[PDB]
Amino acid sequence: QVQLVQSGAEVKKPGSSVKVSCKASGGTFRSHVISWVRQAPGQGLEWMGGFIPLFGTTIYAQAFQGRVMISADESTSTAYMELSSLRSEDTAVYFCARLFPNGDPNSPEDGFDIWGQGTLVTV
Amino acid sequence: IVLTQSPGTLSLSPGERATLSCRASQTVSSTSLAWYQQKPGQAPRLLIYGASSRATGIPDRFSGSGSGTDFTLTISRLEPEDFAVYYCQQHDTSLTFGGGTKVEIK
Amino acid sequence: DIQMTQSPSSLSASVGDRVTITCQASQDIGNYLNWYQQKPGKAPKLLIYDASHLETGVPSRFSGSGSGTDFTFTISSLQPEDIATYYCQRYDDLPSYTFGQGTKVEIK
Amino acid sequence: VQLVQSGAEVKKPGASVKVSCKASGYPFTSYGISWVRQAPGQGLEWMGWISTYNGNTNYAQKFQGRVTMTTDTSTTTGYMELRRLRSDDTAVYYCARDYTRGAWFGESLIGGFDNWGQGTLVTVSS
Amino acid sequence: SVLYNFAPFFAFKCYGVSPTKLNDLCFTNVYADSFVIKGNEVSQIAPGQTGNIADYNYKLPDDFTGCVIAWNSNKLDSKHSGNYDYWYRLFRKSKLKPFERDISTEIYQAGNKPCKGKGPNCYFPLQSYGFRPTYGVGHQPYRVVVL
Structure with missing residues (x-):
């Protein structure tokens, strides 16, 4: 069924923002509030924070809590993590999921997790 | 809405998982419904607020579960500690207590 | 996060086998404890929410308990099919979803 | 917390009762005392409740005019008063601080029937 | 002080004067409000911070909303049947003015029609909160105390 195509895998450097996109695979995004997985390198897990384009304001990641500017523009067929003020902490495989x-x-077999591909960020 | 402690004379010896139906009538969320233990002839203790939930005073040996209208207090290995009188409450809908199901002995 | 771990992590036990499975995190969870078990070859199943009060489904066998730092998901009586890996997510009141390692209750 | 009650109360078939309930070492005014009737074997019959603040009372239809819950707010001793006593009416009751209907309002609040009466073992034997 | 004791609130941030000193200061009444929400509405429950529900339903003034204490009520207001219990008003008409009481649930001006303003017919400012324990806490049950 649904794939939730994600952007790729590149490194980003301090101070700036890391752009990634959970891209729309053939509809099936509207409800599907595109939150964001982080997956810390190999120490632990994480949730990048996501946006709530389902008719309201956005939730921000608990871990970073203030400069996680996670925007996600579902109609444009792109999601974003939009983490302004990156330094190094990323070094991770941030996934897009159907959190x-x-x-x-539809697609209840891909129940409450339609995961993505992953994005290796680092320094 | 009514409550029904089914095994009024549940006779399971200590050390054996049992099942004690207090068996409500509605589909009441246990957010209200609860359990209250009384010594067999004393005032009810706060036994199980949340009607399945274990608080401070309750040991592990006390067990139970349930939802809807068939609340089965599936008690674990037993003790004389668990041989008081337990009255499953309903904080929902004008509280009708329980009257029945003690756990008995040989 | 409290960065969820469970501590007993690999309690080995067959049918019945008076059970103690406890998702003692790094620090305290209060009433913010999921206790998970995964059904192999399928999607996970969240049996219990904070410290207790099992979902309708995944029967009482897997029984939630314990209120403190360590919350005890003891089994009263399992059967051969209750082979299920006991990791534990922690519903953090804003989503954080830190799952566990797997405290599989076995059979021979 | 002790809620000191009466004991083997000797009433009669055609008398009225003044059950004791010493509102114990809690701030009496900020609560409400419910009651249940432990008819022997019959679990507990829902007696009613006094608002220790104002005296708002949810009696039992069973005991509509019979149970008339009063209290000595001064010496903090609850008097759940039932006329219609008899041998078949000789059944023990208890006190309970009603936190289901949190007091002051006669309105349902969180918590259960809170700390309980000693016990009024009403012996109306004939 | 029975304030300070409580377990994690997840909203203890005193919307108003510092989260201290309330026990000590002596005001007449803090007019404790009581309502249910779900998280996306709870986000709007704050001074300033006008948003969807403090943009149709539940607004708060410049400051001094007592010490509003929100918290999720997952286990308490919704069951995994996806409870549809508590009615709220999105598309009520517009944002209500800071800190009123809105038993007035005036219906919505939805146009394309003169008769009752409501567009097709009956534009509900009656939105059974319609959430699920499997959503975000933005959509978890939320019982919240206001001052």
């Missing part, structure tokens, strides 16, 4: 509030009435 728990993201099931369709």
Whole structure:
């Protein structure tokens, strides 16, 4: 069914922002609030924070809490993490997922996780 | 809305997982419904607020679960500690207590 | 995060086998504890939410308990099919979803 | 917390009761005392509740005019008063601080029937 | 002080004067408000911070909203049947003015029609909060105390 195509894998350097995109694979994005997975390098897991384009304001990542400017523009067929003020902490494989509030009435087999591909950020 | 402690004379010896139905009538969320233990002839203790939930005073040996109208207090290995009188409450809808299901002995 | 771990992590036990499975995190969880078990060859199953109160489904066998730092997901009585890896997510009141390692309750 | 109650109360078939309930070492005014009737074997019959603040009372239809819950707010001793006593009416009751209907409002609040009466073992034996 | 004791609030940030000194200061009444929400509405419950529900339903003034104490009520207001219980008003008409009481749930001016303003018919400012324990906490049940 649904794939949630994600952008790629590149490194980003301090102070600036890291751009990645969970891209729209053939509809099935509207409910599907595109939150954002981080997956810290090899020490632990994480949730990049995502946006709530489902008719309201956005949730921000608990881990970073203030400069996680996670915007996501679903109609444009692109998601974003939009982490301004990156330094080094990333070094991770930030995934796009159909994070728990993201099931369709279709595709219940891809229930509450339609994961992505992953993006290796580093310094 | 009513409650029904089914095994009024549940006779399972200590050391054996049992099941004690207090068996409500509605589909009540245990957010209200609870359990209250009384010594067999004393005032009810705060036994199980949340109606499945273990607080400070309750040991592990006390077990139970349930939802809807078939609340089964699936008690674990037993003790004389668990041989008081337990009254499953309903904080929902004008509280009707329980009257029945003690756990008994030989 | 409290960066969820469980501590017992690999409690080995067959049918019945008076059980103690506890998702003692780094620090305290209060009433913010999921206890997970994964059904192999399928999608995960969250049985219990904070410290107790099992979902409708995944029967009472896997029984949630414990209120402190360590919350005990003890099994009263499993059966051969209750082979299920006991990792534990922690529903953090803003989503953080830190799952566990897998405290599989076995059979021979 | 102790909620000191009466004991083997000797009433009669055609008398009225003044059950004791010493509102114990809690700030009496900021609560409400519910009651249940432990009819022997019959779990507990829902008696009613006094608002220790104002005296808002949710009696039992069973005991509509019979149970008339009063209290000595001065010496903080609850008097859940039931007329219609008899041998078949000789059944023990208890006190309970009603935190289900949190007091002051006669309105349902969080918590259960809170700390309980000693016990009024009403012996109306005939 | 029975304030300070409580377990994690997840919203203890005193919307108003410092989260201290309330026990000590002596004001007449802090008019404790009581309502349910779900997180996306709870985000709007703050001084300034006008947003979807403090843009149709539940607005707060410049400051001094007592010490509003929000918290998620997952286990308490929604079951995994995806409870549809508590009615709220999105598309009520517009944002209500800071800190009123809105038993007035005036219906929405939705146009394309003169008769009752409501567009097709009955534009509900009656939105059963319609959430799920499997959503975000932006859409988890939320029972919240206001002052």
